Ligand binder design. Sequence first.
Ligand SMILES: CC(C)Nc1nc2ccc(C(=O)Nc3c[nH]c(C(N)=O)c3)cc2[nH]1
Lengths: 156, 39
Amino acid sequence: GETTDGVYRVMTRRLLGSTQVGVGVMQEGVFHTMWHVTKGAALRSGEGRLDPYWGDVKQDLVSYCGPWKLDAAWDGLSEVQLLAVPPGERAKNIQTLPGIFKTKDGDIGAVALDYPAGTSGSPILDKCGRVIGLYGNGVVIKNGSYVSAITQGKRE
Amino acid sequence: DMYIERAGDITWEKDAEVTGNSPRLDVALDESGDFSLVE
Ligand SMILES: CC(C)Nc1nc2ccc(C(=O)Nc3c[nH]c(C(N)=O)c3)cc2[nH]1
């Protein structure tokens, strides 16, 4: 299958026509996405098969063909870019300054950008173009808008 | 069955559209990976 580094759409033909259920990042021969997108299921890339390698429902992440490769973190100060890949629309970079998700186990960066659930898995980048996390797991605030965590895995 | 399709390169774009605010929200993360608001 196609193994070039970059951002990919995650699609299905099990509903009406072709539907985009999410997005993912190919880096170092490993495909990275959010768990709620695939539910840990195998993926096809042309005539090739990508099998899951690591996953965790609580972190809401899954990697294919190898272990999680993305280790960059938000520095807590600079603006970042959501490389949004919306359904039926072209990839588009949106700059924002992340807010915070305060939890009992520590603070996490969060992006206050609202895209449909089919955009889940779109990468968030730092100034050198490194992936600091994936968009798509968050909360609905008072005004009904979506605020997503900057979700990053651990590189072994 | 699910399939992947390339959508682009991962690069920072100079002069991109700048939008969105930076709210500080108290949240909880359950065993199923769902965030919720603690108010
Ligand atoms: C209507 C407006 C607020 N827009 C809005 N953009 C969204 C993006 C993602 C999700 C979404 O559902 N994520 C998810 C599903 N499952 C998980 C899990 N951790 O299992 C996360 C929902 C959105 N709604």
